[PDB]
Amino acid sequence: HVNSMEAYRIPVRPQTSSGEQVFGFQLQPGHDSVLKHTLLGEILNYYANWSGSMKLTFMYCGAAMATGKFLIAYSPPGAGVPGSRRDAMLGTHVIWDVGLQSSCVLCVPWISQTNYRYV
């Protein structure tokens, strides 16, 4: 899908049971091959250290009559990675309705032991 326009096209659909995952990636800008070739990623790669809070913005490009909610969650490194909606509710999260707003902003907070992180 990276050779077409379908790389930017995160799909959702009516479910059968709730709590399922939509997408998921690691928070490694400059190294993880999802947000490496974005505009933030091509600037960190001229550098060897980064620090600060990132901002993720969404935009539901669906019909005007559909309604639903999502659970967008950031999880600190620790151990390990969450594998359920019950597990990825204890970390930092927001709840985003698509019948009320079309765009949601998730400020990913800076939690680390060091002052900088390696790119």
Partner: protein, 267 residues
Amino acid sequence: YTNINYYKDSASNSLNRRVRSITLGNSTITTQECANVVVGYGVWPTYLSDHEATAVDQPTQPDVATCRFYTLESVKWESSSAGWWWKFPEALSDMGLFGQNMQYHYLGRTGYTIHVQCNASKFHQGCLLVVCVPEAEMGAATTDHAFNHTKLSNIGQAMEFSAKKSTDQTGPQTAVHNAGMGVAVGNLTIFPHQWINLRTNNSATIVMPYINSVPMDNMYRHYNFTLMVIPFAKLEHSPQASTYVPITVTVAPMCAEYNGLRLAGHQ
């Protein structure tokens, strides 16, 4: 009306004649479309004062680790679906550092905020009743027979009502028009409640204080209040519409205190 008092006691006397979000911890729900927030019996959840607090040990108030939004399970709304009930704090007994503080502490006082969310389309129709009932002593299904503590409330599982009556030998009477208490289900609008009309409402937010006769009570043998979601108008749509309409409950403890630190319960 001479109003003289012959005796020395008081008990010997006569008669007396959009964008509005809530950011609790590292957690944010969104939103109410400038609609409404029902709060308790007009009382916001607060801490313990010094006229109260018969205990002498110092209270434990974590304020971030335990007082964030805990998203419970998701249940399925159908046409032939009677209702559900969650008994608190049994429904939050295993979630995060809130359920971990309950095991190490004898007493516990807390208020909650309940956010029941269920979205639909403009072509769906139906109406829910979200009511928070304090001290709902339920009646057994088979009378003159004791009934089990896992039929009243499992740990966070949504116990459901029934359209007919229940002939169980070890559970509660789950006839939904009697609401499990032998009372008319239309008269449960005394307790703090809010409707979810699927054409205008989309959510319900109730904020309940700590309602109990004692200032601090053990939270492993006493159900403080139950939360009942009963549909009065049933869910109806065309067969071409989306048939799976779920109901998610998101609840958060507010101003939680604990006392009596000992080893882990709950024997």
